[PDB]
Design brief:
The structure is a homodimer. Chain A has about 100 residues and is mainly alpha-helical. Helices cover about 80% and strands about 0% of the residues of chain A. The first copy, chain A, has a single domain, classed as Substrate Binding Domain Of Dnak, Chain:A, Domain 2 (Up-down Bundle). Chains A and B meet through α2 and α3 of A and α2 and α3 of B. Chain A: This is Four-helix bundle copper-binding protein.
Chain lengths: ~100, ~100
């Protein structure tokens, strides 16, 4: 229930949706796959520092949130694999607010 | 290529930090946090450099700033302490051309 945990949980969700997206979406472009792929790895970093309750986690969360919304913008779509990703990214960005 | 040089230095920094937090026996809690976080930061940067991502520089700037912080607190006279800081600063300087 703690803000770090809620943010870590959201990061995990962003990771799944992102990896599923670039793995399953057959209509994605290079640009979109680069956005979803980098967003997955960035959220990985954030979740890892959130878990260890690192004093540097917020700095990593800021960067991840910055590109997570950029991914939500480029990957959003009406298709399930597209909205799940974009949504998870939005939710993660939202969870970072209290930690900044 | 400057990216390859930077990724290569990031890889070495990851190696150094890990050997430190795993083998050093004099490290404090804060030094372990610094070394571990620096390892993860350089990891993320290495991944973006591998795929030649346009977001690699932003990630390198973040790893660099904390990599040098890890070198400032972890440096020592023991081989693993000195290699950790040297590897960190080497990664940083290799980031310059990308930042």
């Amino acid at each position: 229930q703690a803000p770090e945990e809620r943010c870590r949980l959201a990061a995990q969700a962003c990771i799944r949706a992102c990896e599923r997206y670039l793995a399953l979406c057959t209509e994605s472009s290079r640009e979109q796959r680069q956005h979803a792929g980098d967003c997955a790895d960035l959220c990985r970093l954030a979740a890892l520092l959130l878990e260890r309750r690192s004093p540097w986690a917020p700095a990593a969360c800021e960067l991840a949130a910055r590109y997570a919304l950029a991914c939500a913008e480029r990957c959003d779509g009406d298709e399930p694999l597209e909205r799940e990703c974009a949504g998870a990214c939005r939710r993660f960005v939202e969870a970072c607010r209290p930690l900044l």
